[PDB]
């Protein structure tokens, strides 16, 4: 029998650990799952359940569902794309686009975009660990309360949107480098924004943040180690490219991304190759002395890339080479990326050059809008 899953959601403030994943594992690659007699009683296995994107549980004896029947696929967007809020809005304006390139690349690969620009709040792939995040808290948090972090650019415009419409204050520390949409962009969304000169990246700000919290009592919601944002995009980017690969008829075999906190690539990458776990995931290595803005080298400290039973295989991608790309995709396509999504473009384009890749589709998620990047935009013109 099915049960809507909204009713049991306190397993994600209760259950802690990935040991829960592999009971997301096991339905993904069986497409289908047991009923719980008690679902009460087996919290592990209904977290497995929201978080590959089931809106309902199987309960009873002995009885299965299949992911069609749990809601992993059904269709939350209205057709009119009309919407009564702006949360709404971002929880039901679901999949974001997936776009077949007009780019052709050697060996047979075929090179759909996926565009995260098409979330509200940032126009970027951060707004879903954003809302996922504070909605987590709220349920704990009280209103008024201040939230913070380190971030990049997009992560702290999500932030401080997403923390208005709950009833919380902001702020946000970028290091001196972070685009200038990034320093601007969260005070006109009433955020407090604190800007660091000294820092070189952002995970450098993390001990000033945590210090801060410290001493001034405001949750640091912490998105390098929050396990939220890896969840976030397990319903959400992972999923989408689950079920659009499916309903579009493609012959899935890869998907490609960049690395800043690793959450969306992570979850891309765990989620696909539990359904098929030849699927490869091609992830960008910024090349070393290179800041593309955004993202980061794996060395330096990534959660889920880590710690999960993932398989990826890295490319070096210097910010020239991002850049060209964002020309090439743009001059190909008509659409502008940012120079994280030119990078994982490129760093596809290497792979398939080695003749690395199986023919087939292969998904790039691109998590931003080249808009944002002008002075980038005019050196690669150069
Ligand atoms: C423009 C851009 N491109 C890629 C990413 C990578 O997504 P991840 O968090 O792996 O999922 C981001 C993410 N931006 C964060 C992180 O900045 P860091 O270099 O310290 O991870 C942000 O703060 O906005 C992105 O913005």
């Not at 029998?1 to 994943?21: K, N, P, Q, T």
């Not at 999949?95 to 970027?124: A, D």
């Not at 890749?357 to 931003?368: A, H, K, N, R």
Request: with cysteine.
């Amino acid at each position: 029998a099915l049960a809507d899953i909204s009713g049991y959601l306190d397993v994600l403030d209760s259950v802690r650990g990935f040991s829960y994943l592999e009971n997301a594992r096991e339905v993904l690659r069986s497409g289908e799952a047991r009923c719980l007699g008690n679902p009460r009683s087996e919290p592990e296995y209904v977290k497995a359940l929201y978080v590959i994107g089931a809106s309902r549980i199987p309960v009873g004896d002995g009885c299965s569902h299949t992911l069609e029947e749990l809601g992993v696929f059904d269709i939350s967007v209205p057709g009119e794309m009309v919407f009564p809020s702006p949360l709404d809005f971002f929880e039901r304006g679901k999949p974001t686009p997936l776009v077949r390139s007009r780019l052709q690349l050697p060996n047979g690969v075929r090179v759909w975009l996926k565009l995260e620009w098409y979330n509200p709040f940032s126009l970027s792939v951060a707004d879903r660990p954003a809302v996922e995040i504070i909605s987590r808290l709220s349920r704990r948090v009280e209103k008024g309360s201040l939230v913070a972090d380190a971030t990049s650019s997009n992560f702290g415009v999500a932030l401080s949107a997403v923390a208005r419409l709950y009833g919380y204050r902001a702020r946000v520390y970028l290091p001196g480098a972070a685009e200038e949409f990034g320093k601007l962009l969260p005070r006109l969304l009433g955020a407090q924004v604190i800007v660091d000169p000294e820092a070189p990246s952002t995970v450098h700000l993390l001990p000033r943040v945590m210090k801060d919290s410290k001493n001034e009592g405001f949750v640091h919601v912490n998105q390098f180690y929050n396990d939220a944002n890896f969840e976030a995009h397990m319903r959400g980017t992972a999923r989408e490219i689950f079920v659009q690969s499916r309903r579009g008829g493609l012959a899935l075999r890869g998907v490609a991304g960049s690395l800043g906190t690793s959450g969306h690539m992570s979850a891309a990458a765990f989620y696909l190759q539990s359904v098929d776990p030849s699927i490869r995931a091609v992830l960008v290595q910024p090349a070393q002395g290179d800041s593309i803005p955004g993202i980061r080298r794996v060395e330096t400290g990534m959660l889920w890339i880590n710690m999960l039973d993932i398989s990826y295989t890295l490319a070096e991608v210097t910010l020239e080479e991002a850049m060209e790309a964002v020309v090439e995709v743009a001059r190909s396509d008509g659409l502008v990326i940012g120079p994280s999504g030119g990078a994982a473009v490129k760093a596809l384009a290497k792979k398939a050059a080695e003749g690395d890749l199986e023919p087939g589709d292969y998904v790039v998620v691109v998590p931003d809008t080249g808009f944002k990047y002008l002075s980038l935009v005019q050196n690669a013109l150069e």
